[model samples]
Target chain A: NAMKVTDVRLRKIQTDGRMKALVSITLDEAFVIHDLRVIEGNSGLFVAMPSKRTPDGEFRDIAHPINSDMRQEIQDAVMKVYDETD
Target chain B: AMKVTDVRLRKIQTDGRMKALVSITLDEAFVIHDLRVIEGNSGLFVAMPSKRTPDGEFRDIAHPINSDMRQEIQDAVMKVYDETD
Candidate 1:
């Protein structure tokens, strides 16, 4: 069976410094989502994993930055999680 | 001279569940970096001890829903009450 695709909104927040891009996401349900890795292409390559969400619809993480390439992979994994969510 | 620099945006688009990317601070300064630590990586915290002014920001901590519940809330109301938030 197919799952109900909820609303997914991404917003670019204000930022500066070594920490660049910042995106805020609003998931439909409190379903579990995987980590989105950031693959750095410049200087060196890097990967960032996902931050676990709390029971109160809140996410927990200190500071995470993944490379560019890994972002897609992470997103793919998360979508899979939602699809298979019980 | 004093200074104030605030910025950092992180996330992406997934086909399903996963949808949140916290910034990756060099050392993950909970005070400065403040984001998420993924994989075999450990998250860090940046501590910024506040002066009786404003440090404990709910926007990044404790409670952030009711404007009055905000740290600044109690403080702003300070003009009315003899209290420190």
Candidate 2:
């Protein structure tokens, strides 16, 4: 079920909160950031956002899931922001 | 052991070749993107590139390792490219 991933741009955000590190991936489809969420899990580690019953009761990020290739893209974006020497 | 990944990132590449699409994750410690591997055809795809031998070889992504959460994010990003009008 590996489909074509389009308009892929990498972005990142260093949060002042407990978020620790947040990788923001902008989809070229509809321009939605939440579509793919990589966040600090309750276990105090980095993990992709789990499936949730959205407020609208719709399944997200399920129809398609993260693969090894995609994970690398996320990691690359985050490093760019965190290592910016700002 | 699932380690603490730092400063994550996501990027996609589309090739007319078989690569079709690709997503990469860059880590901080070693800047290596070794997220859970899927397909791992213990059965179609690489299960997980988790381990490797001392030799310049890769057990490579070997089974049924595609984690759900990871794919969703990938799908989201891929969707963007696919939907690019």
Candidate 3:
């Protein structure tokens, strides 16, 4: 069984930092995950999963893909939509 | 209507009942990491990833929206754990 991305909602942020946009995605039209981020890294644009600062002042992903393949899939999907948006 | 596509488990040596760390991919598109496999009094169960709040209480970072989805994830993860040595 495969899960399909039913919807992707993006909000572009007008900022001067690496952060570019915020995203939320719906899966199989049943579940939704929120707070995904689009970042402009040194190499290029990429997708970052939602994360929080731990007690030690380090950041950890609250929700993220388990593998690189899935990570790239999410990135491509979000970035495509981002490029199409104004 | 979401299905778990892959489950990766890392067994750990622990003094407590925590048996392993687990991460699952949904439909091979989305993933939720940092789940744990625990040996409870009744049996083994999957624990959702969580973060400690300001008050030192643990809260789930991300989890299934409903019981059926939760059970599906748990079942998928535990099946992989059981099959591993």
- Over the stretch A40-77, how does candidate 1's per-residue lDDT look in tens digits? 44774233333445679986453232333334433444
lDDT of 1: 0.30
After superposing candidate 2 on the true structure, give the runs of residues whose Cα lies further than 4 Å from its correct spot.
A1-18, A21-23, A27-32, A35-38, A41-47, A50-65, B1-85
TM-score of each: 0.21, 0.27, 0.66
Comparing 2 with 3 on TM-score, the higher-scoring candidate is: 3
The pairs that clash in candidate 3 are A3-B27
Best by lDDT: 3
TM-score of chain B of each: 0.21, 0.27, 0.91
Local accuracy of candidate 3 as per-residue lDDT tens digits, A1-86: 23555678999999899889988876666666767889999999888887877679998786666556656667778888999999
Q: Docking quality tier of candidate 2?
A: incorrect
lDDT of 3 by residue, B1-85 (tens): 5688899999887779999999887766666778899997898889887766679798766667688888898899989998988
Chain A of candidate 1 gets a TM-score of 0.26
Q: Which stretches of candidate 3 lie over 4 Å from their true place?
A: A7-15, A42-46, A51-86, B53-57
CAPRI class of candidate 3? acceptable
**Cα shift from native, residue B58, model 3 (Å):** 3.8
Using DockQ as the measure, what is the rank order of every candidate, best first? 3, 1, 2
Could you tell me which 10 consecutive residues in candidate 3 chain A have the lowest summed lDDT?
A: A62-71
